[PDB]
Symmetry: D2
């Protein structure tokens, strides 16, 4: 009934059509699965199941989570499956993997997320036939990942709904984004991402490429050039490409086992999963998802907001990230101390486990005792998890 995170790892977050432009998601997930096994001293033959969140798997083949486990050396006797709760998929898979051990149905779980938004294809239903007229080739990334299915507009429009409702101006969102760019750039140059990042070998034509640094992180971001950017969703809006997360590729996961299992193996876990929660909200303001999700998770853990030593709140948009900080009222100096998704990137299926990796390694590095990770979810949902160090 006590589940710990024995190890964690993530690939570098690649830009849209960048280093991982032609790399399938399971190839990134396989590297992460092998990394959490080596870092914990656990062999692949000991894994019972691999649970990987993924939002855009179209065209990758039968169950990409199974392909990642098999390629990482996990034997055929184990099982693997994918799940989709949009942006919270990477974190919910960890909660799902924790429940497999809590119910006594599994002993060792590799849980996380993987996403290749670059490899997302364009699709169209053509079985009935198009007898006459033009038809649209639909971008699966925009349709199945970034567009609300109830109102039809982009997730950035939901951020404009939060910005108008919370009275967050353009200058306040740009200032929040600049702070995120500077924190991520300082953390990258100081090597605070080296422990969590496992290098990925991009096997391509004309030679292999080793990717071990987040390429989407901007250097020397300026407030004046960001004020010149046009709004990306509403012509009279405030959300721009500068104060919003990007389109990215990456993978992240963690190795799960019971606290007694880790103690017999001599493993010092990165943290203990104290509680988790998922709550729904109005799809028009889905960015407010972390507000009830974090409160329920802290309530289940018996913690107060002031008890938290470190917080990782995903920065899908500067508008929604400002609202979550104002509502919950926690000290912003402990939230995303090494930057957020505005600078690091936002691979939907993997962002949930990505910020968990950043949370775990920063908690151990500075000796934080209580931490929380949370994300907003499209369609009006949120997920959160409380972590305690051992």
């Amino acid at each position: 009934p006590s589940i710990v995170i024995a190890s964690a790892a993530r690939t570098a977050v690649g830009s849209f059509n960048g280093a991982f432009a032609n790399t399938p998601a399971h190839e990134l997930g396989a590297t992460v699965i092998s990394a959490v096994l080596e870092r914990a001293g656990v062999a692949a033959g000991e894994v019972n199941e691999v649970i990987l969140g993924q939002v855009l798997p179209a065209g990758e083949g039968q169950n990409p989570a199974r392909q990642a486990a098999m390629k990482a050396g996990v034997p055929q006797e184990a099982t693997a499956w994918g799940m989709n709760q949009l942006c919270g998929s990477g974190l919910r898979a960890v909660a799902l993997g924790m429940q497999q051990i809590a119910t006594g149905d599994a002993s060792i779980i590799v849980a996380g997320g993987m996403e290749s938004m670059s490899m997302a294809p364009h699709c169209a239903h053509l079985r009935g036939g198009v007898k006459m007229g033009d038809f649209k080739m639909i971008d699966t990334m925009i349709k199945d990942g970034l567009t609300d299915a109830f109102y039809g507009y982009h997730m950035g429009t939901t951020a404009e709904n939060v910005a108008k409702q919370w009275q967050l101006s353009r200058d306040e969102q740009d200032a929040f984004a600049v702070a995120s760019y500077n924190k991520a750039e300082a953390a990258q140059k100081d090597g605070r991402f080296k422990d969590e990042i496992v290098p990925f070998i991009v096997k391509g034509r004309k030679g292999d490429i080793t990717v071990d640094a987040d390429e989407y992180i901007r250097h020397g971001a300026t407030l004046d050039s960001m004020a010149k950017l046009r709004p990306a969703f509403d012509k009279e809006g405030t959300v721009t490409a500068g104060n919003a997360s990007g389109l990215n590729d990456g993978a992240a996961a963690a190795l799960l086992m019971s606290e007694a299992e880790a103690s017999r193996r001599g493993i010092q876990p990165l943290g203990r999963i104290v509680s988790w929660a998922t709550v729904g909200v109005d799809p028009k303001v889905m960015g407010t998802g972390p507000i009830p999700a974090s409160r329920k998770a802290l309530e289940r853990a018996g913690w107060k907001i002031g008890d938290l030593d470190l917080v990782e709140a995903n920065e899908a948009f500067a508008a929604q990230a400002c609202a979550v900080n104002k509502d919950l009222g926690w000290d912003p100096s402990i939230v995303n101390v090494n930057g957020g998704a505005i600078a690091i990137g936002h691979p939907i299926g993997a962002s949930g486990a990505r910020i968990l990796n950043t949370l775990l390694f920063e908690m151990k590095r500075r000796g934080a005792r209580k931490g929380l990770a949370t994300l907003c979810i499209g369609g009006g949902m949120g997920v959160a998890m409380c972590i305690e160090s051992l």
Copy 2:
């Protein structure tokens, strides 16, 4: 914790490009979600989470499970997500929903599966651009649903591997299929599918159509006409369209709650989830998946194979379905007493909950005490669950 299935429902299984040719999967799932709520006397405002297995969601929009819950009246405060374990997705979602209640994280769960193989689009990655030459538009149904990602051939080829290793001839597979067609046709004419089936209204322009009968069920199947069919995968093989499951659309789900919760509401549950299991096998012979999965489920329940009163083993192929019966050795007269997927249909993401519906309502109809449902999974996996009546 003791979790029971308070109610269950399913749509009729439609043929490929048939009654549900232009109906999205979440529309079928929404009808099933509302049905299990009315059948149990539980309102939509009481559901904590909806968990729906789905293999082919490309082009349907952000998280079709969330769309099904919202369309069925489930409030925005609740959560919803999809999961993919291929053919066992519909059944695993019930086991996953059971774990949400076992860990005290939820109270009432709608769990099941939905699949629209007809609405599966053709896709192609076109972000890098096609400078010269032809490129392939990939059928997501074949690629992401029916083709093994490790060996490259169809799931029907894996049935040929099972037929060769178990020495199951063409006449033995056709005889098994004829038995499935006759059992399903007799069950349909006797109305044994009426209780589990909830009608679906296909809203069109030239009038609405009510679908309340499985259209893929064949009437008067003859052994001689099936012996004339050419093999559909191997030119010198034995698996044909007659002795194999079809491509179908449909949805199925169940309402989950604790046994004490069901007693507080005066609900007579359809059954109690005693145990469940999922095991992996060699992808070349994925049809053997139910063999170790069923024994592991019976082992966790403390049951012997002889203790089972009824069995629902998915008939993905006659070759794999014969092998599972020969290895486990249970009485074939209690396995798929109302027919199987060869005659009823095989909507991959929903078949797990489809055979669970047939299992639950047949146990209640004839007073069976111990039941088991199991399916084979592509990529070399299997899933099983044991059900006991109250």
Copy 3:
């Protein structure tokens, strides 16, 4: 400088996605080329060049006119090419083939048109790549065939412009269309199309099918049933599917040689090409094209409007066909005596030679001496040709 039409033939006009749904245009053209050779007693080795009008050749391969000639038995030493003047392509190709003999550059020409609107594919420029967002698969039939490239609307909208300028009401267009349906229906049942139609054998997998009757001809068109039809282009317009031409497939051609050549071979020509003309008009009212084209053709032939015994004016739309009849003032009883494109069909690339075939054989049956064929052309053009019997 006197070129006669030694023989002529055409396939039956098939409906959109009908009998010729999967038949390429050059296969239909090859049958017409072989027919006019046998009907005139000329061997394939004697043809110098084949000129076939075609508007929609995308996806059919290198020069479909060359494919039709080679398949029809025309030797490799001869030449072949296609031309595109939209709806007047079938007639202009005959005039172009006549000029080959008039300038002494050729002796025997097979000229006509072929069109397979059913086989017209959907296209999209994808060399630059689609990094993000949806893109349109463009119907080549609508884009390159039925949409004005200067104003962007359908040819039916240009018909509404002619109806508005000429004050042609809905009842006047429907009454004009009914006359065409009744004339075509009576002509088909009386066998008046048998001489001009050469049967085509549609080779399929489940048996060959011989198509020798115009499939688009409807039986018993009623003024009341057409008055209930909704307008097909303008919501407050008058052009409907009943009073407008359809989308059809077919091929037609004629064998051209000098009058001395026909006399040396003992060939009785169907008629002598007296004159031809092509004039442009405003693209907004392209249906008025036949008005100056016919007057310029009659001027070059030295004929008066009253001298014509029979007229074949293409019925692309009832609105444009009424305007040309009122302006030119010829007796409507001699115009389209066997029906027009509203009832028979409108294969764009072949319609020019289609109405020429009907003109030649109708002139021969009733002994008409002077005839004229004309069509309207998209983009604001018209073509006409005068024929005199031998």
Copy 4:
């Protein structure tokens, strides 16, 4: 009776996906039509018809020749149409325009060719529907332009057939290409292409670009670097990208009128069309097309091979260009004195008029009296034209 070329012009030949990557073909043709009118002092209202050869018009709209004329200022009263004889379309259109004046049906004709191989889309017939399985998106450039419709292989394979029958080694083909690169590079540096080239303004968003130089011209071509090139068609073949023409965009045309018309307007014509011819050959060796076509043109002109002062023979492939020169036996020093299609480029629909422009202006530059232009045509055809200076 005697038709002269009053003026001629052409755009620069752009590389594949280069300066004209997003420029439609009719935009290039419109500039050429306006150029030949201004250079001759003839207003747009005096042209009777515009004839433009084009092989790949899919997706450009209704009759791109009509779009080019209207955009160039040609009034709506005139007519326009396109024609397709593959690689000989640009030259055949000039012969066709000459026949319009010879038969007294027109007085002033703008004839030439235009081609945008970069804007060629990918297509697929989808009206019947794809019920199951993958399907191919067909590149219209390769299928309708570069692939033989009778044998299924590329035009480069037909060049391998000519090389095999004529025993043309790899070094012999490479030496011919090197000579073409050096002659074309020297002609560009000396400004010998400035008179025939009319600048084209590429209007874009981030600024306009003026294209007035042939971009496909290679600088400092080395014989050894072409020997290192891999064969592009046959793994054991000899035709490579160095000794074969490229994929290019461009447009070219000429102003046609009678000799008396040019004298009445005070125009100094570029030359007189003495004769023309088109002959077919074996499709396997389509590169031999120019051999019988040139002989028939010289026969009609009453000229011997020794009477020719300058020759422009299209260099579709080094294998076919060597064979036609060796068979006809004309002095290689007078053929393609300014380079050929290997270095200049090969826009299929415009190459016929492209080499005519180079022929006309080079004859005037060095005072050549008798010239001939010829091209090979896919599918087994050839075209030729004899020009004499006034």
